Amino acid sequence: RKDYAKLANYDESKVPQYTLPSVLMCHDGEMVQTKEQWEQKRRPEILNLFTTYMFGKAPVLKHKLPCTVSRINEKALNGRATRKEITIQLTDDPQGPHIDLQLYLPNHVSGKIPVFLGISFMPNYTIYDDPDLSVPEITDEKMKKRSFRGSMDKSWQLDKILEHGYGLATFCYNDVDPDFDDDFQNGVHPYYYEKGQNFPDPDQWGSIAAWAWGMSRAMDYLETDKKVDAKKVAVIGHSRLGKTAVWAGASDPRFALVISGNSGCCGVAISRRCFGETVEAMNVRFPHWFCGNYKQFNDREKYLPFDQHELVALIAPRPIYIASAEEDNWSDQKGEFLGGKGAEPVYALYGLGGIGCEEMPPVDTPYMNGPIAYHNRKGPHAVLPYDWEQFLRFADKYFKN
Numbered sequence: 171r172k173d174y175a176k177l178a179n180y181d182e183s184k185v186p187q188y189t190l191p192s193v194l195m196c197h198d199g200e201m202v203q204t205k206e207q208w209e210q211k212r213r214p215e216i217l218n219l220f221t222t223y224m225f226g227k228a229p230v231l232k233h234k235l236p237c238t239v240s241r242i243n244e245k246a247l248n249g250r251a252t253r254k255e256i257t258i259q260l261t262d263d264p265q266g267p268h269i270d271l272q273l274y275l276p277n278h279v280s281g282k283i284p285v286f287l288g289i290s291f292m293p294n295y296t297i298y299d300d301p302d303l304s305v306p307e308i309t310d311e312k313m314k315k316r317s318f319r320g321s322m323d324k325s326w327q328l329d330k331i332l333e334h335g336y337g338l339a340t341f342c343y344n345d346v347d348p349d350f351d352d353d354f355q356n357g358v359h360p361y362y363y364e365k366g367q368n369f370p371d372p373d374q375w376g377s378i379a380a381w382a383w384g385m386s387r388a389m390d391y392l393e394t395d396k397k398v399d400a401k402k403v404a405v406i407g408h409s410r411l412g413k414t415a416v417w418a419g420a421s422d423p424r425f426a427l428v429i430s431g432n433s434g435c436c437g438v439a440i441s442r443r444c445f446g447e448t449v450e451a452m453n454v455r456f457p458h459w460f461c462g463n464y465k466q467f468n469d470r471e472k473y474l475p476f477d478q479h480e481l482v483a484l485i486a487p488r489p490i491y492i493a494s495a496e497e498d499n500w501s502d503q504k505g506e507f508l509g510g511k512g513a514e515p516v517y518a519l520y521g522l523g524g525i526g527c528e529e530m531p532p533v534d535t536p537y538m539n540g541p542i543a544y545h546n547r548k549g550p551h552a553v554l555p556y557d558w559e560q561f562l563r564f565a566d567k568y569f570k571n
């Protein structure tokens with residue numbers, strides 16, 4: 171019902187007073203001052219609070235899901251790449267939902283290959299204009315195409331990625347759970363209900379948590395593929411899928427590097443600023459996104475047990491790239507910058523520096539010599555070739571020698 175877009179505040183001066191919850195102080199009040207105390211005592215407290223109160227618990231599995239490598243082309247893209255389709259069975263029902271993962275690896279590169287794991291709004295054929303993914307429309311019985319081959323090429327830059335000697339793997343988020351407020355009708359959630367349960371408990375996963383769990387299932391296959399380097403898998407997504415990729419990085423330490431693509435409100439942006447999008451605008455307009463518990467903080471940011479700098483802190487010591495867009499005031503770009511700045515004291519526990527500047531930098535001015543990178547670039551809320559340029563130059567610092 172309510173608007174929210176026109177009620178929002180975009181005026182830095184009308185931003186309220188606030189105090190950031192202290193990331194280094196435990197629940198019992200003892201301050202952390204060593205990485206040991208962070209890993210042993212404080213980090214699990216913060217992981218617990220984000221799992222309990224905003225993203226929701228996700229199933230732990232006795233064993234890996236079944237998958238099959240259902241298609242391979244070692245001469246894909248005129249011999250430039252090997253293309254693999256991997257279907258991952260998400261539930262115990264083989265006619266239930268599956269992740270249809272699409273992996274591209276460069277040919278002519280010897281070792282195990284670093285890979286960017288991404289999650290997309292649309293099906294796999296939009297990632298690249300791949301001409302041998304082609305059967306005519308008049309004979310096609312498969313799902314009717316809503317976009318076109320390679321429509322999202324500007325958001326994925328496969329050519330840039332292969333050129334750095336890296337791979338790209340992606341799946342569409344609707345494989346795991348449709349982005350509709352439908353009580354998870356056609357998603358994975360009901361397959362993991364107990365017999366006396368007909369919707370997730372208030373502390374159990376919503377959609378973002380399920381989509382993140384999906385990336386983790388894709389990593390379960392990737393780490394068994396002899397050509398990919400299981401030590402150098404990055405995660406990336408944009409907007410709601412940026413919120414997802416940050417959570418997947420936070421709750422799955424296997425991932426080597428995290429890319430926040432305009433993750434904004436309830437991503438890396440500090441909620442207490444109440445700038446642009448707000449917790450309540452979020453939960454009211456997308457109630458399936460977060461767990462039941464999170465709705466208690468509608469218009470009540472003062473009472474969050476945490477704020478989003480502590481989410482970023484879950485990444486440390488691993489690197490994270492925070493990307494803002496100049497026109498995307500809805501994401502609160504300064505707030506996104508401050509989400510990274512608030513995490514600096516944890517990274518210092520590992521003897522690492524910070525972003526590299528004290529106040530928010532001007533547009534088109536990246537900082538990436540520290541463990542947390544930041545840019546706010548010209549133009550619109552999206553992931554553009556400009557963003558991939560910075561992403562890949564940051565990744566080279568960690569994956570190349």
Ligand code: NA
Binds near residue numbers: 440441443447448500
């Ligand atoms: Na905000």
